[PDB]
Amino acid sequence: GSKLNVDQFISSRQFEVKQLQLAMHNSKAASSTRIFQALPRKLRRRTASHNVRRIPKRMRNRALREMRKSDAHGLNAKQLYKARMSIKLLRLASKSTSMKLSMPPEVTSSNCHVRQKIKTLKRMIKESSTANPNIKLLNNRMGSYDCTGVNELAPIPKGRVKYTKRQKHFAWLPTHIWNAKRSHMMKRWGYQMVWAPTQKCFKLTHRLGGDTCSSDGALCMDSSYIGTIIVKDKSNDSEGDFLKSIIGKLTAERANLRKYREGQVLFQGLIYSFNEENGEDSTKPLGPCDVFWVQKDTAIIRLHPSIYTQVFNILLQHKEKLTVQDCRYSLASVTLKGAKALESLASCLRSTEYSKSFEQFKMVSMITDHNALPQRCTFAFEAIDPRHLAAPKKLNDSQRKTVNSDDILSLHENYPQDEINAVFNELCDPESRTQSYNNQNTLKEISARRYKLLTATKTTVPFKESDDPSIPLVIIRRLKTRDWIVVLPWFWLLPLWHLLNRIPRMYHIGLRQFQQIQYENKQLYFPDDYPFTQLGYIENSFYKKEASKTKWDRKPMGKRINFEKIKDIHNTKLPAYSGEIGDFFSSDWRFLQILRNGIDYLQRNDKTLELMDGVRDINCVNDVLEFCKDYEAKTKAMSLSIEENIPVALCKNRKCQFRTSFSLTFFPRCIIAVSCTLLERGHPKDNARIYQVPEKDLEHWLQLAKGVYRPNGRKDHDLKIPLPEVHDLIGFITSGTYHLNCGNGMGIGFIDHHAAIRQPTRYVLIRNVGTNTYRLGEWSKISV
Amino acid sequence: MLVDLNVPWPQNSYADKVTSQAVNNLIKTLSTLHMLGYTHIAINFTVNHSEKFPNDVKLLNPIDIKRRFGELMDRTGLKLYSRITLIIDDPSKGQSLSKISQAFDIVAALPISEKGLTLSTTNLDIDLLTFQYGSRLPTFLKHKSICSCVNRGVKLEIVYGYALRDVQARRQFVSNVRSVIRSSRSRGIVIGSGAMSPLECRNILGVTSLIKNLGLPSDRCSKAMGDLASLVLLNGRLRNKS
Amino acid sequence: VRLKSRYILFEIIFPPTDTNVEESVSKADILLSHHRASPADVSIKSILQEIRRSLSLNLGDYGSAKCNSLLQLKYFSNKTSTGIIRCHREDCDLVIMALMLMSKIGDVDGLIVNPVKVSGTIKKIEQFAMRRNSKILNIIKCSQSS
Amino acid sequence: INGVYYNEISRDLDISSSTQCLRFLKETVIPSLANNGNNSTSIQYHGISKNDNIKKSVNKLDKQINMADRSLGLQQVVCIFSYGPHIQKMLSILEIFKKGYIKNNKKIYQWNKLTSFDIKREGRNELQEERLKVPILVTLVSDSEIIDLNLHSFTKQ
Amino acid sequence: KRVTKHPSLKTLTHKQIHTTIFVKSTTPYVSALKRINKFLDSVHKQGSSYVAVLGMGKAVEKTLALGCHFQDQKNKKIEVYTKTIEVLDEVITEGSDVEDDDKETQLKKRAVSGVELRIYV
RNA sequence: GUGGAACAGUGGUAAUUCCUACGAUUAAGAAACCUGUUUACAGAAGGAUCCCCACCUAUGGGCGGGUUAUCAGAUAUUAUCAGGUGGGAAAUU
RNA sequence: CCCGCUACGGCGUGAGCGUCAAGGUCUGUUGAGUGCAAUCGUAGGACGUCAUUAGUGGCGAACCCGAUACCGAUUACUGCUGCUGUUCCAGC
């Protein structure tokens, strides 16, 4: 041991840091790994060891040299013709859909014969050879048609001859096989939509598509399942008198604004199903709705598919003057989300004419921001088929590197209503979308045109006003869900969709990922976060209860959590009752509303409430709880489909003044939607109980909110937590997931408005499933 | 953040004057404590019970944190607390607690007697109990005298600095510490470094392994070193201030 | 299939036992006074022969039999006096308590051993050691600039 | 607040008292970073508290950029400064002043400096003593591009 | 009068997004230290000179506290710039009984001064 | 033909039992390990009330200059922290 | 390729764009993501099974364990459930 100088010390330690870094890099280089493992974990290909074409071209030479260093069937007389029948059917189907003509209905139904299909495809070619008339002759080479049903619902689409009996029970997305190669889909409704990506993308979609600032990417959702109807007034060519009335009948006076007539912005809100038979009006909460208008009179309304069938049935009930237009297989939108989604979307499309909407969209595409733009951003134009490009390329002008809010206000002042609404009129009418397919080419044809440009003359195919299929294209902003949705015809979507993620910073969304996006932005979701409505309550309660009951009876005894014997749940443990509040599974709003009306009957009976000891005399809590258990035991035998139990309050508080016989459950209870954030340690889960702060213990929770902990220096909650009573419950968290954008726990709950006006402070405690701890938090109101 | 509360002051009697080498040795060993990493420092001083206590107010403490260590407190980034261990054997020339508790902060005791343990658990409102891990066990530890005293609030202290003294003393050290662990029911165990030289200081990772292999679990050891140490610090601080 | 063996980082610190020599009170100055240098006769085999003798005289034979199953010094350099000892996850307690009771080398006395980092992988221990040495360079640069 | 330190040296200041800390910034911090003796600069000092009127302080800054003599060839520098939660108000009285100057086809050359006080406080725990580091914004604005002050530690804007 | 606000323009490229932190008022101190330290660890992979720290309004002071930490204790060269920020706000102008959010929304600009703070490696 | 006991074969399904707390840093990523508390704003952007002096009018008041007090949702806290960590088979290819 | 100087191809900035090349890098990494390969230790409470002398004690395993992710099939073991086959024992 001997003292050294300062400079020699810092030089020796810096040389040691450099030596350790060089040794770590040398160990990482001497670790025997392939160049196949040199790819990122998103791009790793298992079949790249078989064929080299998955590997990047810079790396394929090393892959070839290391792969070199490392190193017509028996068919009977019947199944041969059975195999040749399919090959002949595919060949005749390709020639029939390619040459001139459309599809017969007998081949579409595919429930009679295959020899009749062969004879029909043989007969159509001969009829085209012998004569020009009597032919349903198409307008293009690729087999595209017009699946538009005027005044009736759209039937099962024709699709392809080979993949026809695969569409017998459920229909497909236009990107069905493409999404099927890259995602997990579930079969729930009549379509088959994506559920989750194959590679893990929880935190990935959370960071790139989320509300986080570090969102250097783009996320695309196939939202073709969202069904739209187009309504137009046939009675008068003048101003729309019945349109405002039918909007005020379908929705409330919440979405019938004069502002939405003037500024024509799409609005998403809550629709409720009306029913007027004779002098009586019954209103039930129906679900979400998207309303959009064209300057005064024509309207597109798009929403959830079962709700779409119900709204179409109610609209077909009263169809006296106005003409309805069902669009299930002729128009669909896809949803882009993120910071660079606008840049990739402007990269995917090009211009065919110098217009104002191109200039507005190209300036919007460069700012890389969403919420700084105003509420109305609905752009529409005519563009080229994106099969002309087939390459990831972006187009950006000089623009002198300047972005200010003054140019945004200048685009807000000047809005090209005429051309955008003309594109709207083109997409609503069935004749213009049919005229759009007048020059649709095959991939062989666009490859031949690219070869002609490579021979004559750059990576492009030029536009011709005579023989190129100019499409209508509409890109609009959706406000509360913070995402850009772009709508297009059915057979046009896939040439737009395939070129999207070939931009190297664009990934796809699943339905669980869309639920995560709606969970992150403090928003709401219809199959899960809407329990108040009829269909949401039915689907959520039935499916989650049956799934959880099958899982509970599926697990053996003594390995799962046992819900029957849990000690110390509430203070003063009530007799004939040892379990948790309601059923242990999915949210029992029936239990909550019967207990709320029981506490209301106790408050109407006396100024205070007693604790404990054909309908027996209600004087305390357990008489209400035994009636709850008896009603649950009765409804386990026969399912309930009579009425709802919990509506919302946010439409009732403003106007109806939330006003509420031997009755225990006839008049339902109204709720407001809240989002509570955890201030204490812990995270929430699904189906979580939501309780009041005690008034005797309010100062203790205020001291815990300010601060109290052991003198070590770190936070303490290992203390005697005072247990409140059973009837202090006010709500249910349906969606419980650890909120990564805040660093805490988020729970979407639904609390009573009378209970909300009881406490002067927003401090509300949460309790998980099968866990006997209480965690305080603070809620903010969800105005959705 | 860690608390080390058993560093001795190189003086035993008030008649002996501390030389200049002992002050420098204490500065070196406390800087060695800050070198390996500790937040709180509570230096200890030994007072015999047979010694006659002085009738003074500002002269009870020959430690002087303000004039000597007040510079190192500002430069290094730590603090010093004062504490007294009471070598009590027989009930004679004593029973005075109202004056020594106000000047100093933490009041500890060293019983080596059978009746001394009883008079320590009965009529001494002290913070920590210390046993002589260097010498032999006094009589025998039982659950009856320990459990009645730990539940009151007094903690039992283990000196891991006395183990690095001799070779023969290590056996009696282990035989005392394992007896304290089996009698303590693994609750009231505060550990401290009794180093007189800077060559005998260790870090948290070795001391945690030592107390883990001697018989205390990893939860109770680290939970003690944080919570019970910083709790008895505010016990002394509230006996001072309030 | 693999083996779950833990690595332990240790550093040799020399306490400045100088009773007649005065001392300077600072952070990076006492880091300079403790992180001085390793002596001349210090190698891998010398530290292994010393720690096996300490394991014998302190912990015994059968405890030394359990400890010496995978008792190896994987990386050590005398210029920085930091070393990495491989061990089992069960006897890691025994290895750290053997590192604590290291009193002196047979050639040079007056030294303490600081076990700093324990992990089941050596690559994260190297990443922690680079960051800890970077913080040491930060403290040195702060006291050197002012 | 137990004590206020600047550059690890004990000082007698109070954070709730604005006048004493502004005079300490004027008398001690700015001569420790800039020396007006060895050059030909005319430095006009101004501090901003959170109770100051914005329009009146900008109008005071409208007279300090043209206060010294133009015939002597002296470059005129305005040293505006604040500390802590007053700095934001300073920023308004900064940038609106820039809004009052760039419309006349002229330019402000700007130098920024960020230093700090270190204050000690007792915590919610008694043995835990907390340290808070209060930021100081010092901005030197001028119409000249090159100033002979020792401004190597600043930030050109 | 009911009025609501929107966030600010963030014109960023591929390389500017991974090296820029935007400090909120609810942003903790040690959280900001950890995030800017992770940005200093990843800026060699991003391959740029500085890490940007931007704040406006109430966060500005504690944003400057970030520049008070890494300049002295870690010897980092920082640059301090004062910028203007335009914010669009939706306000209601009075001109039945409708819901409070369903009224006439008019955009009004509002300027806030803010601080950019660049930290070198 | 029935009931009980034992064995064998196949089909379906499940596996850290679950919860709670703790495990050194102004050197602020050391319980073994990872991620997060980053779409910056207190309608404090010519902010509000108030002190003194001078001016004009009078039944109210306004302007200019100077220092500077109070206020920004629970009169508070700028420097803490949260969550997770193996499976039907991850072995076999 | 646009701006300024200079004018035969030139020079300086934009934290601008397009093409090409490089065993320079890929924690660009996944509600686990290591890469000489982490997935921990302990205490208390709830539940299940088995054995008790006073009432408690032991056990919650077997097989096995990522390295890009997905799904089908096969193999190793425990428990539950339905079917089938064999043996033994009776109600008349």
Swiss-Prot record, chain A:
Subcellular location(s) of the protein: Cytoplasm; Nucleus
This protein's record includes keyword Phosphoprotein: yes
Residues carrying Phosphothreonine: 457
This enzyme's EC code(s): 3.1.26.5
GO molecular function, one term: ribonuclease P activity
Keywords of the record: Cytoplasm, Hydrolase, Nucleus, Phosphoprotein, rRNA processing, tRNA processing
Top enzyme class: hydrolase
Reaction(s) the record says it catalyses: Endonucleolytic cleavage of RNA, removing 5'-extranucleotides from tRNA precursor
Gene Ontology terms: biological process: intronic box C/D snoRNA processing; maturation of 5.8S rRNA; nuclear-transcribed mRNA catabolic process, RNase MRP-dependent; rRNA processing; tRNA 5'-leader removal; tRNA processing
Domain of life: Eukaryota
A Pfam family this chain is assigned to: POPLD
Main localization category: cytoplasm
InterPro entries: Pop1 (IPR039182), POP1_C (IPR055079), Pop1_N (IPR009723), POPLD_dom (IPR012590)
GO terms for cellular component: cytoplasm; nucleolar ribonuclease P complex; ribonuclease MRP complex; telomerase holoenzyme complex
Other known facts: Present with 846 molecules/cell in log phase SD medium.
Function: Required for processing of 5.8S rRNA (short form) at site A3 and for 5' and 3' processing of pre-tRNA.
UniProt subunit comment: Component of nuclear RNase P and RNase MRP complexes. RNase P consists of an RNA moiety and at least 9 protein subunits including POP1, POP3, POP4, POP5, POP6, POP7, POP8, RPP1 and RPR2. RNase MRP complex consists of an RNA moiety and at least 10 protein subunits including POP1, POP3, POP4, POP5, POP6, POP7, POP8, RMP1, RPP1 and SNM1, many of which are shared with the RNase P complex.
The protein's name: Ribonucleases P/MRP protein subunit POP1
Swiss-Prot record, chain B:
GO cellular component, one term: nucleus
Keyword terms of this UniProt record: Hydrolase, Nucleus, rRNA processing, tRNA processing
GO biological process: intronic box C/D snoRNA processing; maturation of 5.8S rRNA; nuclear-transcribed mRNA catabolic process, RNase MRP-dependent; rRNA processing; tRNA 5'-leader removal; tRNA processing
EC number: 3.1.26.5
Reaction(s) catalysed (UniProt annotation): Endonucleolytic cleavage of RNA, removing 5'-extranucleotides from tRNA precursor
Subcellular location field: Nucleus
An example Gene Ontology molecular-function term: ribonuclease P activity
Class of this enzyme: hydrolase
Subunit composition and interactions: Component of nuclear RNase P and RNase MRP complexes. RNase P consists of an RNA moiety and at least 9 protein subunits including POP1, POP3, POP4, POP5, POP6, POP7, POP8, RPP1 and RPR2. RNase MRP complex consists of an RNA moiety and at least 10 protein subunits including POP1, POP3, POP4, POP5, POP6, POP7, POP8, RMP1, RPP1 and SNM1, many of which are shared with the RNase P complex.
Something else known: Present with 6300 molecules/cell in log phase SD medium.
Physiological role: Component of ribonuclease P, a protein complex that generates mature tRNA molecules by cleaving their 5'-ends. Also a component of RNase MRP, which cleaves pre-rRNA sequences.
Annotated family: Belongs to the eukaryotic/archaeal RNase P protein component 3 family.
Protein name in UniProt: Ribonuclease P/MRP protein subunit RPP1
Organism: Saccharomyces cerevisiae (strain ATCC 204508 / S288c)
From Swiss-Prot, chain C:
Reactions catalysed: Endonucleolytic cleavage of RNA, removing 5'-extranucleotides from tRNA precursor
Enzyme class label: hydrolase
Principal subcellular localisation of the protein: cytoplasm
Superkingdom classification of source: Eukaryota
Enzyme Commission code(s) on record: 3.1.26.5
Location of this chain's protein in the cell: Cytoplasm; Nucleus
Keywords assigned: Cytoplasm, Hydrolase, Nucleus, rRNA processing, tRNA processing
One Gene Ontology cellular component annotation held by this UniProt entry: ribonuclease MRP complex
An example molecular function term from Gene Ontology annotations: ribonuclease P activity
Record-level GO BP terms: intronic box C/D snoRNA processing; maturation of 5.8S rRNA; nuclear-transcribed mRNA catabolic process, RNase MRP-dependent; rRNA processing; tRNA 5'-leader removal; tRNA processing
Signal peptide start-end: none
Note from the entry: Present with 2230 molecules/cell in log phase SD medium.
Function comment: Component of ribonuclease P, a protein complex that generates mature tRNA molecules by cleaving their 5'-ends. Also a component of RNase MRP, which cleaves pre-rRNA sequences.
Assembly and interaction partners: Component of nuclear RNase P and RNase MRP complexes. RNase P consists of an RNA moiety and at least 9 protein subunits including POP1, POP3, POP4, POP5, POP6, POP7, POP8, RPP1 and RPR2. RNase MRP complex consists of an RNA moiety and at least 10 protein subunits including POP1, POP3, POP4, POP5, POP6, POP7, POP8, RMP1, RPP1 and SNM1, many of which are shared with the RNase P complex.
UniProt record similarity statement: Belongs to the eukaryotic/archaeal RNase P protein component 2 family.
Protein name as it appears in the record: Ribonuclease P/MRP protein subunit POP5
Gene: POP5
Curated annotation (Swiss-Prot), chain D:
Pfam families the record matches: Alba
Assigned keywords, A-Z: Coiled coil, Hydrolase, Nucleus, rRNA processing, tRNA processing
E.C. designation(s): 3.1.26.5
Coiled-coil region: 50-70
One GO cellular component term noted in the UniProt record for this chain: ribonuclease MRP complex
Keyword Zinc attached: no
InterPro entries: DNA/RNA-bd_Alba-like
Annotated catalysed reactions: Endonucleolytic cleavage of RNA, removing 5'-extranucleotides from tRNA precursor
Localization per Swiss-Prot or TrEMBL: Nucleus
One MF annotation (Gene Ontology) recorded for this entry: ribonuclease P activity
Additional information: Present with 3180 molecules/cell in log phase SD medium.
Described function: Component of ribonuclease P, a protein complex that generates mature tRNA molecules by cleaving their 5'-ends. Also a component of RNase MRP, which cleaves pre-rRNA sequences.
Quaternary structure, from the entry: Component of nuclear RNase P and RNase MRP complexes. RNase P consists of an RNA moiety and at least 9 protein subunits including POP1, POP3, POP4, POP5, POP6, POP7, POP8, RPP1 and RPR2. RNase MRP complex consists of an RNA moiety and at least 10 protein subunits including POP1, POP3, POP4, POP5, POP6, POP7, POP8, RMP1, RPP1 and SNM1, many of which are shared with the RNase P complex.
Protein name: Ribonucleases P/MRP protein subunit POP6
Gene that this polypeptide is encoded by: POP6
